[PDB]
Design a protein around this ligand. Structure first.
Ligand SMILES: *[C@@H]1O[C@H](CO)[C@@H](O[C@@H]2O[C@H](CO)[C@@H](O[C@H]3O[C@H](CO[C@H]4O[C@H](CO)[C@@H](O)[C@H](O)[C@@H]4O)[C@@H](O)[C@H](O[C@H]4O[C@H](CO)[C@@H](O)[C@H](O)[C@@H]4O)[C@@H]3O)[C@H](O)[C@H]2NC(C)=O)[C@H](O)[C@H]1NC(C)=O
Length: 361
């Protein structure tokens, strides 16, 4: 059972206790930790932040304490243009230059593999992603002839049905990747002028135009498209999404005015860390969608959709019974990593809760 965990660069800037460094990570917690995000420059992989070299270094020391722990570097991200990626992939003289630069960069900084986070390929891009993945794995295989352990190659693949069909040749790229992580936590957002959950586990016989909007369907679809179970990994969020209510309506369907106010530490409209959520929960109204099996809370004119220990453990049994490769967690820095905000004295409450399910029968 794999446990892929993401650590984000920009989390170091958060003030006070918000501050997170590779330091805070417990070496036995996950199986793979992925540094997010690298940058591309002069058609070559390159760092992003100024002090990345230092952080790459800090993160890869964890391996001193745990030899079986593998790390990967992710290229892409949202704040990276899909356009830019699209440009390097369609012109063979740019693609090859990009591909050739990776083994060397990873080896230098002590990474065990590369994670492709192209968000998102357009209908014109599908053919070029397959090529990138194909040639990139070919290069990794050729490099192993030098007597070193073959690099891993993974991909972050979005979970909305329409998104998938547009730009991913699932059957094709699955034979080349080592694992695929399904972003099963972006099923709703402020862009829909109503209140709703972004990571429901099941459909819930309530509404029926978006039956493709839940983890369960996404997983089944991917399996039908040809991805082997032993390579699929399900995404579990550690954050929640917030919304400013536009009325006094709190139930399903309720009207929205826009995203929620920023968190004291994460400072971002519409997002909240689990540890910020734990604070918000005090004097908040406790609610839970029984059909879909995820919780939401509301206080004043704020409405928050999030995941707690019970829902996360529930998602974990699901991937187990369906026999998937494992779980992916976005992101370690949004969990209560110090273990002092969510009552119980436990660091990484959410991620450990997952591990507990994955670690038993
Ligand atoms: C991730 O990598 C990205 C890709 O490199 C980084 O993007 C860089 O962004 C900067 C600022 O946003 C851009 O800025 C430069 O603006 C002009 C743009 O013209 C150029 O880019 C062409 C791309 O190939 C080159 O062919 C040209 O030579 C030219 O550089 C630059 O020219 C400016 O500076 C330089 O200009 C001349 C070049 O002859 C020199 O004489 C100067 O002394 C100076 O060196 C700016 O640097 C840039 O487009 C862009 N990409 C590149 C190739 O660097 C991005 O910053 C990074 N992300 C983060 C946040 O780290």
């Amino acid at each position: 059972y794999k446990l892929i965990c993401y650590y984000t660069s920009w989390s170091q800037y958060r003030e006070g206790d918000g501050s997170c460094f590779p330091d805070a990570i417990d070496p036995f917690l996950c199986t793979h930790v992925i540094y997010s995000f690298a940058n591309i420059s002069n058609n070559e992989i390159d760092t992003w932040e100024w002090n990345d070299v230092t952080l790459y270094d800090t993160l890869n020391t964890l391996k001193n304490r745990n030899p079986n722990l593998k790390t990967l570097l992710s290229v892409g991200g949202w704040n990276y243009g899909s356009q830019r990626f699209s440009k390097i992939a369609s012109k063979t003289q740019s693609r090859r230059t990009f591909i050739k630069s990776v083994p060397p960069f990873l080896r230098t900084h002590g990474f065990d593999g590369l994670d492709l986070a192209w968000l998102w390929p357009g209908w014109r891009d599908k053919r070029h992603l397959t090529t990138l993945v194909k040639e990139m794995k070919a290069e990794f295989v050729r490099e192993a002839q030098a007597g070193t352990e073959q690099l891993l190659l993974s991909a972050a693949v979005t979970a909305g049905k329409i998104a998938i069909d547009r730009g991913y040749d699932i059957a094709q790229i699955s034979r080349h990747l080592d694992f695929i992580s399904l972003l099963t936590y972006d099923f709703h957002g402020a862009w829909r002028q109503t209140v709703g959950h972004h990571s429901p586990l099941f459909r819930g016989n309530e509404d029926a135009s978006s039956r493709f909007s839940n983890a369960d369907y996404a997983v089944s679809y991917m399996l039908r498209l040809g991805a082997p179970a032993n390579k699929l990994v399900m995404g579990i969020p550690t954050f929640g999404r917030s919304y400013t209510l536009a009325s006094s309506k709190t139930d399903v369907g309720a009207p929205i005015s826009g995203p929620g106010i920023p968190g004291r530490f994460t400072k971002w409209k519409g997002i909240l860390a689990y540890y910020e959520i734990c604070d918000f929960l005090h004097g908040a109204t406790t609610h839970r969608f029984r059909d879909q099996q995820v919780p939401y809370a509301t206080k004043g004119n704020q409405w928050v959709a999030y995941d707690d220990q019970e829902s996360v453990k529930n998602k974990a049994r699901y991937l187990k019974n369906r026999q998937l490769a494992g779980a992916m967690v976005w992101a370690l820095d949004l969990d209560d990593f110090r273990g002092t905000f969510c009552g119980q004295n436990l660091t990484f409450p959410l991620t450990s809760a997952i591990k507990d399910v994955l670690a038993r029968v």
